[PDB]
Inverse folding.
């Protein structure tokens, strides 16, 4: 994935979020600290917060990231799309995990009911654990893909099954 | 052969697990009937669980067959074959990589079962409901559910399970 | 596959062959009986026989199959093409086995050295034996695919590994 | 991690199987050298078999590692991961379904090893030679060869084997 996409992936709460534009940041709802009253030096009163289940969007009054251009955010993607999940791991390593996307689904995964777009990893038969699959610390990582000359962001990492083969992207 | 067990039934198909046990997709079963396979309903134990239905006959309908293993779905990552018959005489064993159990929105409608993706004519069509999902485990064939639903595109399918 | 393709698949020697046109029949070399001096009621002297290893083409002086139109025969297909192998089995059943095609290869398969286009079956993990894979009696069955509005024939079945997962198409 | 074993070497990469054993693709190895990893060649046992090369050091170069299982290819149908590193810091574990051992014509040239097809950025590039092919078997990781060649398209790859 391009360096400009990796620059938008930001360590946040118990996981990650992603800058869509200078004023719009998206994440997975459960990584946000429940007591938090201040984000990027701005009080809640100066932020419009739009929560749809495990999808959260923050729209700031001030340009927080003026180095960035606005890109396209869509509500999931067509069945069969191959996305990359933009995962940062311990030591400047960058893991763009390949995932074939499927239908919108409701599942029970460990102690949680989750709803979003399902997908199947294309990294191995080999996805139980950190080397070729996801870990709980990856929540909030963006799902991206290239369409003609444009990159699209279409959701944030919300959950993975015990085997690691199935993942769920929370969508706007 | 496995293929001899795949039988035309209602608006689709079903599968003989043994001489006495037949499995199908619930929505393909006729809603007006007094017998199946020549046996009165009173001689049949019918077990419905959402889109999965099992029939257990009092007499041997298919005595030519041996019993095989029936399980509730299969591990994620298993590559199943869906044993699709067409009225042309074509046999289409389609490869599907299986995923999680889930409630899925498949052309507007909520279907509960095991998700799968095709590895690929080369896809399912509506008249294919009830076809069995099978795989080879060591020396033994396993049947693990019945074809319930597919999206417009044909990447995503749903195996209804016991 | 269309009924017109199945009509061209013909029981022949120890396997199968395929009518490309009214005058051209293709097969796998090893299914032809070694003593044979007559084919479709025509003597050898009235047939042009072109053998390239496990690929054999017969061009007849008379129209043997005037019910048929000539179709396109090519020398294998691009890597990544999904072909159907047109296999007839015991009882009017028709098995168009799906195969993802790969590189031209030289292999040792059981007691034979074989050369042709390799492919991997898409019927299962499940291809050891007759139900979802090939058997020795399938040799000579055609490899076909659709390109825009045309069907193409691109070789004949020559061999399969012990697991059943890899097959070899003999090519012109 | 498995990834810490993947090391830049020559015109590509190699892999530490244990503190003393390093595997790579033969064509990536320098042809002008008096040492590797600080050890004189006289202190190194070099075993070449076509496009597969194994180095066995007299001293522990990577004492932080445990030995893992090295095998001569893998069964057909195994889904391997190729552990590709890029100089950007990207880690690209690519899924490949493995096929037969064969001599294959790969961009004009004959390469002997185990064929594979990608299940899919999303493919290999020339600087990737020497990356290991791995898979999980029960509880144990297995390495079964090194990346030797790929076609222009990226469907077909060749794993060089011991």
């Amino acid at each position: 994935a391009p360096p400009t996409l990796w620059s938008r992936v930001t360590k946040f709460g118990s996981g990650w979020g992603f800058w869509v534009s200078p004023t719009v940041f998206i994440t997975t709802t459960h990584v946000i600290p429940t007591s938090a009253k201040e984000f990027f030096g701005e009080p809640l009163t100066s932020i419009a917060i739009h929560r749809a289940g495990e999808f959260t969007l923050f729209r700031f009054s001030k340009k927080i990231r003026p180095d960035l251009t606005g890109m396209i955010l869509e509500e999931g993607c067509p069945e069969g799309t191959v996305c990359s999940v933009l995962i940062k791991r311990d030591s400047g390593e960058l893991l763009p995990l390949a995932v074939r996307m499927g239908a919108i689904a409701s599942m029970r995964i460990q102690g949680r009911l989750v709803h979003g777009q399902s997908g199947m990893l294309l990294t191995g038969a080999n996805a139980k654990g950190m080397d070729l699959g996801t870990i709980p610390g990856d929540c909030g990582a963006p799902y991206v893909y290239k369409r003609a000359n444009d990159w699209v962001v279409c959701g944030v990492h919300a959950a993975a099954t015990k085997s690691g083969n199935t993942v769920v992207c929370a969508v706007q």
